[PDB]
UniProtKB/Swiss-Prot annotation, chains A, B:
The gene is Rag1. Changing H18A: Allows robust hairpin activity. Belongs to the RAG1 family. This is V(D)J recombination-activating protein 1. It comes from Mus musculus (Mouse). Catalytic component of the RAG complex, a multiprotein complex that mediates the DNA cleavage phase during V(D)J recombination. V(D)J recombination assembles a diverse repertoire of immunoglobulin and T-cell receptor genes in developing B and T-lymphocytes through rearrangement of different V (variable), in some cases D (diversity), and J (joining) gene segments. In the RAG complex, RAG1 mediates the DNA-binding to the conserved recombination signal sequences (RSS) and catalyzes the DNA cleavage activities by introducing a double-strand break between the RSS and the adjacent coding segment. Autoubiquitinated in the presence of CDC34/UBCH3. Changing H57A: Impairs DNA-binding.
Length: 68, 68
DNA sequence: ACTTAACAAAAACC
DNA sequence: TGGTTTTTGTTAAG
DNA sequence: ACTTAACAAAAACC
DNA sequence: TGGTTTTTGTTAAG
């Protein structure tokens, strides 16, 4: 069978890191090939656009206030 | 030749969306296959772990205060 | 610190 | 007991 | 609103 | 003028 997966957000940073391991690589590969290795700006923008795609403008604005 | 790319963070949300278009798909595909289609939690965690990997704990804490 | 991979063991499933 | 996968932490390396 | 793809045109490069 | 790619916005569809 295998142990059931807990929600990503409930996991330790260690276990969270283990689950995204493969996507972290794909993101790295993309950022390198297309955005001059700027993972932060890429993940920041993915997250921002993911928020605004969901109409969470208030949260997106607050994150945009934090990042400057 | 082709027009030089501006920095991702200087672009309009429209143009930003156009550049990440392909990574947005890979992220979608991953979230669906591995995280029950939870793009937000995935991008949130990628960004958080990207911040803490860079020792930007203060910013990561503030984003973690915003998201609850 | 952070990262990484390896070695472990416990946990939760069959 | 056996299996598995997930979760954690430690351990040994950058 | 958001999304998407299409159609446009201007911009910045050759 | 031609080419290209990028940037924007609009347009027509969910």
């Amino acid at each position: 069978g295998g142990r059931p997966r807990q929600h990503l957000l409930s996991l330790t940073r260690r276990a969270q890191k283990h689950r995204l391991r493969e996507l972290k690589i794909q993101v790295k590969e993309f950022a390198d090939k297309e955005e001059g290795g700027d993972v932060k700006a890429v993940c920041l923008t993915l997250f921002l656009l993911a928020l605004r795609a969901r109409n969470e403008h208030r949260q997106a604005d607050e994150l945009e206030a934090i990042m400057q």
